């Protein structure tokens, strides 16, 4: 396989949906499965080798991929060849709102995150601890982020037309590279649509191939 895509899942999907392999031999896809960044950086070493790589993330995974990239540059490692972010409101924007502390959230407020279906009320109690921990990750990946472009890799934002994520156009500030945004038909999970998935996939492959052209 030429490239290696490192995918970061959303809250709920057990890293399954991003089991996108066989295309036919372009991407070796490896998925996350939930200073935590340090634990990821040295864990991507044995699989990155010296081959080129890219990051894709959805909602929660967008913040995680971003900080993982941001944390690779800090260790003087090479950044991802491309950073693909999906359905996430950037930390520095007019629409962003800070995630409250754990001890300031009620189970009811935790239950509203789980919806991102409302029928499930009793189940929320058993999913409560997973959710609160996931929010802890996101609360950290959105805390103390620089106000200066640290990254330099190219960046594409994907977002649904009926999405709850907003103002992704502002993600361009986190890097000095080229920033593109595509608005696709769907909600917060547009990317499940086999049409949108095909669009995203093909766009990822084209991106990495063009960025891999010799510097002549
Ligand atoms: Cl999420």
Curated annotation (Swiss-Prot):
It is found in: Cytoplasm, Cytosol. The keyword Lipid biosynthesis applies. Its EC number is 3.1.2.14. Detected both in lactating and non-lactating breast epithelium (at protein level). Isoform 2 is up-regulated in bone marrow-derived mononuclear cells of rheumatoid arthritis patients. Pfam families: Thioesterase (PF00975). InterPro entries: AB_hydrolase_fold, TEII, Thioesterase. Keywords: Acetylation, Cytoplasm, Fatty acid biosynthesis, Fatty acid metabolism, Hydrolase, Lipid biosynthesis, Lipid metabolism. GO terms for cellular component: cytosol. GO terms for molecular function: fatty acyl-[ACP] hydrolase activity. GO terms for biological process: lipid biosynthetic process; medium-chain fatty acid biosynthetic process. It catalyses: (9Z)-octadecenoyl-[ACP] + H2O = (9Z)-octadecenoate + holo-[ACP] + H(+); decanoyl-CoA + H2O = decanoate + CoA + H(+); dodecanoyl-CoA + H2O = dodecanoate + CoA + H(+); tetradecanoyl-CoA + H2O = tetradecanoate + CoA + H(+). Its main location: cytoplasm. The active site is at residues 59, 188. The keyword Cell cycle does not apply. It comes from the Eukaryota. Contributes to the release of free fatty acids from fatty acid synthase (FASN). Has broad substrate specificity, giving rise to a range of free fatty acids with chain lengths between 10 and 16 carbon atoms (C10 - C16). Belongs to the thioesterase family. Interacts (via C-terminus) with FASN. This is S-acyl fatty acid synthase thioesterase, medium chain. The gene is OLAH.
